[PDB]
Amino acid sequence: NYGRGRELMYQLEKKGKEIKRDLEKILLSGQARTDVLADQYLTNSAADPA
Amino acid sequence: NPTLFVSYDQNGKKLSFANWISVLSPQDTPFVSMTGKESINQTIFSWQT
């Protein structure tokens, strides 16, 4: 431990949150709204037959 | 039906175990106990000569 000493690799808390530039694209992308709840979200037809 | 109660009918013992253990395995490490130690940063290192 005489060389690398940048906080003992405590990174990924800031300057490294690049996930934001992927979230931005996910929002401004033309992906569908696929789901499994039959688009109702409140089926509850005798204890969620699904 | 005893009449003397001599060190055998005494129920409810405690076993008077000891408070140590004898690890007789050989732990003698003279080379290690003699050679010093040094904190290294990375896995790989070097020394000049």
CSV table of C-alpha atoms in Angstrom, one decimal:
chain,number,residue,atom,x,y,z
A,1,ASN,CA,0.0,0.0,0.0
A,2,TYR,CA,2.7,2.5,-1.0
A,3,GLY,CA,1.1,3.2,-4.4
A,4,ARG,CA,-2.6,3.3,-5.0
A,5,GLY,CA,-4.1,5.3,-2.1
A,6,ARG,CA,-7.2,7.0,-3.4
A,7,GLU,CA,-9.4,6.5,-0.3
A,8,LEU,CA,-8.9,2.7,-0.6
A,9,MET,CA,-11.4,2.6,-3.5
A,10,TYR,CA,-14.3,4.2,-1.7
A,11,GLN,CA,-15.6,5.4,-5.0
A,12,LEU,CA,-19.1,5.0,-6.6
A,13,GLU,CA,-20.7,7.6,-4.3
A,14,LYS,CA,-20.3,10.6,-6.5
A,15,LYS,CA,-18.5,11.3,-9.8
A,16,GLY,CA,-19.3,7.9,-10.9
A,17,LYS,CA,-23.1,8.0,-10.7
A,18,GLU,CA,-23.2,7.6,-14.5
A,19,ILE,CA,-26.4,5.5,-14.0
A,20,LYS,CA,-28.1,8.9,-14.4
A,21,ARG,CA,-27.1,9.2,-18.1
A,22,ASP,CA,-28.7,5.8,-18.6
A,23,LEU,CA,-31.9,6.7,-16.7
A,24,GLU,CA,-32.2,9.7,-19.0
A,25,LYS,CA,-32.1,7.5,-22.1
A,26,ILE,CA,-34.5,5.0,-20.6
A,27,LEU,CA,-36.9,7.8,-20.0
A,28,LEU,CA,-36.3,9.4,-23.5
A,29,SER,CA,-36.5,6.0,-25.3
A,30,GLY,CA,-39.5,4.4,-27.0
A,31,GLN,CA,-39.9,1.3,-24.8
A,32,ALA,CA,-43.3,-0.2,-24.3
A,33,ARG,CA,-45.1,-0.6,-20.9
A,34,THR,CA,-45.0,-4.4,-20.8
A,35,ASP,CA,-46.3,-5.9,-17.6
A,36,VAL,CA,-48.0,-9.0,-16.2
A,37,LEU,CA,-51.0,-7.5,-14.2
A,38,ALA,CA,-53.2,-7.6,-17.3
A,39,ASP,CA,-53.2,-3.8,-17.4
A,40,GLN,CA,-55.8,-3.6,-14.7
A,41,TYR,CA,-53.6,-3.5,-11.6
A,42,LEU,CA,-56.6,-4.3,-9.3
A,43,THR,CA,-57.8,-7.7,-10.7
A,44,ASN,CA,-58.1,-9.2,-7.2
A,45,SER,CA,-60.6,-11.6,-8.7
A,46,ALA,CA,-60.9,-14.2,-5.9
A,47,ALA,CA,-57.4,-13.8,-4.5
A,48,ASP,CA,-55.3,-12.9,-7.6
A,49,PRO,CA,-55.9,-15.8,-9.9
A,50,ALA,CA,-52.6,-14.8,-11.5
B,1,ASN,CA,-29.5,-48.4,51.3
B,2,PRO,CA,-26.1,-47.1,52.4
B,3,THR,CA,-25.0,-46.4,56.0
B,4,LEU,CA,-21.7,-44.5,55.4
B,5,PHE,CA,-22.1,-42.4,52.3
B,6,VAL,CA,-18.4,-42.7,51.2
B,7,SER,CA,-17.6,-40.7,48.1
B,8,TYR,CA,-19.7,-43.0,45.9
B,9,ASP,CA,-23.4,-42.5,46.8
B,10,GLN,CA,-22.8,-38.7,46.5
B,11,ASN,CA,-25.1,-37.8,43.6
B,12,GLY,CA,-25.0,-34.4,41.9
B,13,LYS,CA,-21.3,-33.9,41.2
B,14,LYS,CA,-19.6,-31.0,39.4
B,15,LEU,CA,-16.8,-32.9,37.6
B,16,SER,CA,-14.2,-30.2,38.7
B,17,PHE,CA,-12.9,-29.7,35.2
B,18,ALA,CA,-9.8,-27.7,34.6
B,19,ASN,CA,-9.6,-24.2,33.1
B,20,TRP,CA,-7.1,-24.8,30.3
B,21,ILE,CA,-6.2,-27.0,27.4
B,22,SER,CA,-2.9,-28.6,26.3
B,23,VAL,CA,-2.4,-28.2,22.6
B,24,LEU,CA,0.8,-30.2,22.4
B,25,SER,CA,1.1,-29.8,18.7
B,26,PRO,CA,4.4,-28.2,17.7
B,27,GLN,CA,4.1,-24.4,17.3
B,28,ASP,CA,7.8,-23.7,17.4
B,29,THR,CA,8.4,-21.2,14.6
B,30,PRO,CA,11.9,-19.7,15.1
B,31,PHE,CA,12.3,-18.4,11.6
B,32,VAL,CA,9.1,-16.5,11.7
B,33,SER,CA,9.6,-15.3,15.3
B,34,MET,CA,13.0,-14.0,14.3
B,35,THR,CA,12.3,-12.4,10.9
B,36,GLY,CA,10.6,-9.0,11.0
B,37,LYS,CA,7.4,-7.9,9.3
B,38,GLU,CA,6.5,-4.9,7.1
B,39,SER,CA,3.2,-3.5,5.8
B,40,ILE,CA,3.1,-3.6,2.0
B,41,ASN,CA,0.6,-1.7,-0.1
B,42,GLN,CA,0.1,-3.9,-3.2
B,43,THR,CA,0.4,-7.7,-3.6
B,44,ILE,CA,3.6,-7.3,-5.8
B,45,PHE,CA,6.7,-5.6,-4.6
B,46,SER,CA,10.5,-5.4,-5.3
B,47,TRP,CA,13.8,-4.6,-3.7
B,48,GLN,CA,17.0,-3.1,-5.3
B,49,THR,CA,20.5,-4.3,-4.9
